[PDB]
Curated annotation (Swiss-Prot), chain A:
Residues represented out of the complete protein: 119 to 314 of 559
Modified residues (Phosphothreonine): T199
Protein localization: Nucleus
Function: DNA- and RNA-binding protein, involved in several nuclear processes such as pre-mRNA splicing, apoptosis and transcription regulation. In association with FUBP1 regulates MYC transcription at the P2 promoter through the core-TFIIH basal transcription factor. Acts as a transcriptional repressor through the core-TFIIH basal transcription factor. Represses FUBP1-induced transcriptional activation but not basal transcription. Decreases ERCC3 helicase activity. Does not repress TFIIH-mediated transcription in xeroderma pigmentosum complementation group B (XPB) cells.
Residue numbers of Phosphoserine PTMs: S129
Modified residues (N6-acetyllysine): K136
Subunit structure: Homodimer. Associates with the spliceosome. Found in a complex with RO60 and Y5 RNA. Found in a complex with FUBP1 and far upstream element (FUSE) DNA segment. Interacts directly with ERCC3. Interacts with CDK7 and GTF2H1. Interacts with SRSF11/P54. Does not interact with ERCC3 in xeroderma pigmentosum complementation group B (XPB) cells. Interacts with ARGLU1; interaction may be involved in ARGLU1-mediated modulation of alternative splicing.
Name assigned to this protein: Poly(U)-binding-splicing factor PUF60
Family, as annotated: Belongs to the RRM half pint family.
Gene from which this protein is expressed: PUF60
Note: Does not repress TFIIH-mediated transcription in xeroderma pigmentosum complementation group B (XPB) cells.
From Swiss-Prot, chain B:
Residue list for modification Phosphoserine: S31
Entry PTM: Ubiquitinated. This targets the protein for proteasome-mediated degradation.
Organism: Homo sapiens (Human)
Leader peptide range in chain numbering: none
This protein's name: Far upstream element-binding protein 1
Gene responsible for this protein: FUBP1
Residues of the full protein shown: 27 to 52 of 644
Subcellular localization, as worded in the UniProt entry: Nucleus
Function: Regulates MYC expression by binding to a single-stranded far-upstream element (FUSE) upstream of the MYC promoter. May act both as activator and repressor of transcription.
Superkingdom in the source lineage: Eukaryota
Amino acid sequence: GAMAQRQRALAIMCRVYVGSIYYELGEDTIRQAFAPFGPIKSIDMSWDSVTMKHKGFAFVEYEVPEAAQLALEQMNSVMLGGRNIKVGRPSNIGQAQPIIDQLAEEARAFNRIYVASVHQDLSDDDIKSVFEAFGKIKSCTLARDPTTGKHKGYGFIEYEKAQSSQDAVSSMNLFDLGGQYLRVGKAVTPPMPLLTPAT
Amino acid sequence: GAMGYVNDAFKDALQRARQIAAKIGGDAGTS
């Protein structure tokens, strides 16, 4: 089976479109701006001319669509500079909508919350401080990063109750770690390798 | 009080939260 897209819907959902790029920021800056969200897997960049004035557009692909979701929900709603960027491609929406709503509802069965903008040193049990002070958690693990050596700036925390999950989301954004406010959301696709057949 | 906008729970959270940041993230001296 050539061309491993593994459900084209999810493949694109993990990759956000960045339009209306400010000016003094490029792939160098955008990488870091969305770094607390998810690890940059690949970038479809449009460098125009040797001048490097990035005349065009860019695509930021993450390892997890949850980071892409937060990039859509928060980054497009909050001006990260003197210019608002357009995240995503409103074209195949509606067609892939039943899939999106399916994934969200399907991952909802695990009622796990998504923790991003996690401080690199601050560890899993540390993030537990805030989450477990509001409600109860059954599983807590920040994804380990092989190239960083410590852990990626995100993780998947699991509440036992859907009420407490919603309580956490409302306050966990404000989680200040050394000057940076955290960023929480939800799991949009089942972040577990429950794929028996590798088709 | 009101949930979602928790007053005590989230302050419990953050006393722990900067405690965890005090060891790793930003040393504030003692605590």
